[PDB]
DNA sequence: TGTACGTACAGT
DNA sequence: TGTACGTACAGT
């Protein structure tokens, strides 16, 4: 069905406000938070059990919201290290979808200063 | 004459091998090192007195060599902080040139994963 | 600024 | 991995 588009890093932030435990090398789920009064483009980050860990960094969510809202790609997330950080942790992301959507995803990331590695 | 194209960060590396002193907020000069056997795209970084400080990071020089070699832009460099680092220091760069060359510079940076901020 | 934090692990 | 290093200074 869906094919791989590529990979990208970013960060989970606001760890200080949530209690959802993450382990190194563990997947996390990205879920849009459209009614967030602080950022309309907000994207929450949950652990494998559905417990919130934090949010995607503001700038990254600025890029990704359009992709998620328009079902242009499914975004997988893995935390490579620093599961025990205080404030922030790194996020390895992979984008999957229909071949015909790759350009639109690639451009939406470029428009915000991100590039599919 | 020349007009501003914009700004970009990178890093000076290999500080360990040179003795050229830099102070915070001081300009540095970029000079191509074309006969470098380790990297053909090498770009040296000198202090205001002409003493070598280090090199542009490999990836960044990969982007910039073409720009410098083809006189597409003049690149100014300022070290914002960390003049007393051990191995690496940050570099705020600004690109100046003829209006008609901006696109070519912008694209050459994109091709290597850099963007004019 | 100094320091508490994040993370690379040290040219070209 | 732990740690020596670089640098942000701590959601959305």
From Swiss-Prot, chains A, B:
It comes from the Eukaryota. Expressed in brain, heart, kidney, liver, lung, pancreas, placenta and skeletal muscle. It is found in: Cytoplasm; Nucleus; Nucleus, Nucleolus; Nucleus, Nucleoplasm. There is a cross-link at residue 57 (Glycyl lysine isopeptide (Lys-Gly) (interchain with G-Cter in SUMO2)). Interacts with SP1 and SP3 independently of DNA; the interaction with these transcriptional factors may be required for basal transcription of target genes. Interacts with EGR1; the interaction requires prior binding to DNA and represses c-Rel via a DNA looping mechanism. Interacts with GATA4. Interacts with PCNA; the interaction promotes polyubiquitination of PCNA through association with the UBE2B-RAD18 and UBE2V2-UBE2N ubiquitin ligase complexes. Interacts with RAD18, SHPRH, UBE2V2 and UBE2N. Has both helicase and E3 ubiquitin ligase activities. Possesses intrinsic ATP-dependent nucleosome-remodeling activity; This activity may be required for transcriptional activation or repression of specific target promoters. These may include the SERPINE1 and HIV-1 promoters and the SV40 enhancer, to which this protein can bind directly. Plays a role in error-free postreplication repair (PRR) of damaged DNA and maintains genomic stability through acting as a ubiquitin ligase for 'Lys-63'-linked polyubiquitination of chromatin-bound PCNA. Belongs to the SNF2/RAD54 helicase family. RAD16 subfamily. Subject to frequent epigenetic inactivation by promoter methylation in colon cancer. This is Helicase-like transcription factor. It comes from Homo sapiens (Human).
């Amino acid at each position: 069905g869906s094919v791989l588009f590529g990979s990208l890093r970013g960060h989970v932030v606001g760890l200080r406000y949530y209690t959802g435990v993450v382990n190194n090398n563990e997947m996390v789920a990205l879920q849009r938070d459209p009614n967030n009064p602080y950022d309309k483009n907000a994207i929450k980050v949950n652990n494998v059990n559905g417990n919130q860990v934090g949010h995607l960094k503001k700038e990254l969510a600025g890029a990704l919201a359009y992709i998620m809202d328009n079902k242009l790609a499914q975004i997988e997330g893995v935390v490579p290290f620093g599961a025990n950080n205080a404030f922030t942790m790194p996020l390895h992301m992979t984008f999957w979808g229909k071949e015909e959507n790759r350009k639109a995803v690639s451009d939406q990331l470029k428009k915000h200063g991100f590039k599919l590695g």
